[PDB]
């Protein structure tokens, strides 16, 4: 129903445009709401836009450097926040109410992580974490190193291997760059007879690194 654009970095004075595509099916035409949430903080309403009238609403706190527009031609709403300051670093969501069964309910997008930084976008370095020895069951995985900004999306076997996977939360390095890992639990007997591959996606740099893992 709601699919948002991808994560970006933006220098401390720039602007960013987040897109929300209402691709669902509906007889309800309620506004597209925008709510952001900074890491660990709570929810914050920014404003919305009633597609019909075109009338947009803005929480005063954002009035002046935020503009919500909807392109009816593509059923895609947009939120542009400008004069970007460091505290604008957060996950931006779009939401919309609707009638399901004579009862209200509201769908939320997957959100987008806008990172306010004067740092350059760096692609990750993917290293294989070969199994055996220190792994009945053996653990193998990938070490996604030194990237920026977040997030990174680790998958196995293009998506087939969706069982026993464990992609951990990234860690922030003193260098300011990010590093994360993704392990998998697999039958030691399947090792030699199964091809393991982690497909790491870092949309912020339009990079996808497909790395194969194995032992000696």
């Amino acid at each position: 129903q709601l699919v948002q654009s991808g994560a970006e970095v933006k220098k401390p004075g720039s602007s960013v445009k987040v897109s929300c595509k209402a691709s669902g099916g509906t007889f309800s035409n309620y506004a597209i709401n925008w709510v952001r949430q900074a890491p660990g903080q709570g929810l914050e309403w920014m404003g919305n836009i009633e597609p019909y009238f075109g009338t947009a609403n803005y929480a005063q706190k954002f009035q002046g450097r935020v503009t919500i527009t909807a392109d009816e031609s593509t059923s895609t709403a947009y939120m542009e926040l400008s004069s970007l300051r460091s505290e604008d670093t957060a996950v931006y969501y779009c939401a919309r109410y609707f009638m399901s069964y004579k009862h209200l309910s509201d769908y939320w997008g997957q959100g987008t992580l806008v990172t306010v930084s004067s740092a350059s976008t760096k692609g990750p370095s993917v290293f294989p974490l070969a199994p055996s020895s220190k792994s009945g069951t053996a653990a193998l995985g990938c070490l996604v190193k030194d990237y920026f900004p977040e997030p990174v999306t680790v998958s196995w076997n293009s998506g087939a291997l969706t069982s026993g996977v464990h992609t951990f939360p990234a860690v922030l390095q003193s260098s300011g760059l990010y590093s994360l890992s993704s392990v998998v639990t697999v039958p030691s007997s399947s090792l030699g007879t199964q091809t393991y591959i982690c497909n790491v996606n870092h949309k912020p740099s339009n990079t996808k690194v497909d790395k194969k893992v194995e032992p000696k």
Partner: protein, 211 residues
């Protein structure tokens, strides 16, 4: 905005209520108040709307009350899953301005303690050749998220040179955490073995690895 208690606690089967108290220009000015449930790393789920109505599909264990300038969410038959941050929401009478509460961290007590399941990986050959050496220590499904990591070199506290994460509320309510020890592809070979000490409550698991 709207103020709600920073946190609450409760044992299974028991039931508590979270209060959200605002003013007469918001909560006290209509029945446009709702409650959202937000599990770690997920988007908020609408639990109660228009003061007391529940969306279709939400457990009727959740009920919403409203009176004067404050709203109340009551969770009964408390289950472990109920654990998450809860937010209250208000809409002005015109539906042209909404505002959320500060959020309240609910935590279900009487939850079985689990020890960390540690795993340590040595610098990949590939990386070493790339003149880098990175040790990766993945701490898994424990409870509570009260763990402390310490790295050693042969047997001596290689404190500083590390980077650990913060416990992250996993799916199954337990926690997980990483820990990376960066070092020179020389300092790794020129040393017997490195280890990752993961102490947590009584238990203290530690995995060592060597070139």
């Amino acid at each position: 905005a709207l103020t709600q208690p920073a946190s609450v606690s409760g044992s299974p089967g028991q039931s508590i209520t979270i209060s959200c108290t605002g003013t007469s220009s918001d909560v006290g000015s209509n029945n446009y108040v709702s409650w959202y449930q937000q599990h770690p790393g997920k988007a908020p789920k609408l639990m109660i709307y228009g003061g007391s109505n529940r969306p279709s599909g939400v457990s009727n264990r959740f009920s919403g009350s409203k009176s004067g300038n404050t709203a109340s969410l009551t969770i009964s038959g408390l289950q472990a899953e109920d654990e998450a941050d809860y937010y209250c929401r208000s809409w002005d009478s015109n539906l042209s301005y909404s505002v959320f509460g500060g959020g309240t961290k609910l935590t279900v007590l009487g939850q079985p303690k689990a020890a960390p399941s540690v795993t340590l990986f040595p610098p990949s050959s590939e990386e070493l050749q790339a003149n880098k050496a990175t040790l990766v220590c993945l701490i898994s499904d424990f409870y509570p998220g009260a763990v402390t990591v310490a790295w050693k070199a042969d047997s001596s506290p290689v404190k500083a040179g590390v980077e650990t994460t913060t416990p992250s509320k996993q799916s199954n309510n337990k926690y997980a955490a990483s820990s990376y020890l960066s070092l020179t592809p020389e300092q790794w070979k020129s040393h017997r073995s490195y280890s990752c000490q993961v102490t947590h409550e009584g238990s203290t698991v530690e995995k060592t690895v060597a070139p």
